[PDB]
Amino acid sequence: DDLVGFKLFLPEGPCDHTVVKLQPGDMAAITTKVLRVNGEKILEDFSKRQQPKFKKDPPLAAVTTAVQELLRLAQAHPAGPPTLDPVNDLQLKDMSVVE
């Protein structure tokens, strides 16, 4: 169940969020889905709220929408949606990768 595709994580608790500074190696796959979320507003909301005294402000609509869209993506695929194939979605032709 873990070696076929990418295991869609279902959070055991409430659907919270974090904003992490990820390296290239920490992301398992570049998914095909296109979620048009606005990075500027999410930065202007997260960086403002992440003051420990102002960490408890009511959520912004863009952040709530992004979290809900990610959770719905997790629910909407039984084992993970297809990734942007190096060859079949990025239009490459290396034989070794096909093998």
SS3 label, residue 54: coil
Q: CA-based angle 58:63:67, to the nearest 5?
A: 115
Q: Which region holds residue 5: left if phi is over 0, alpha if psi is between -120 and 50, else beta?
A: left
Q: What is the largest CA-CA distance in the chain?
A: 55
Integer Cα distance of 36 and 86 in angstroms: 22
How far is Cα 21 from Cα 23, in angstroms, rounded to an integer?
7
Which value in Å is the resolution of this experimental model? 3.1
Report in angstroms the alpha-carbon separations of 28 from 25, 31, 95.
7, 9, 22
Q: What is the DSSP letter of 58?
A: P
Identify the helix (H) or strand (E) that includes residue 46: helix 39-49
- On the 0-12 / 13-18 / 19+ scale of CB atoms within 10 A, 4 is exposed
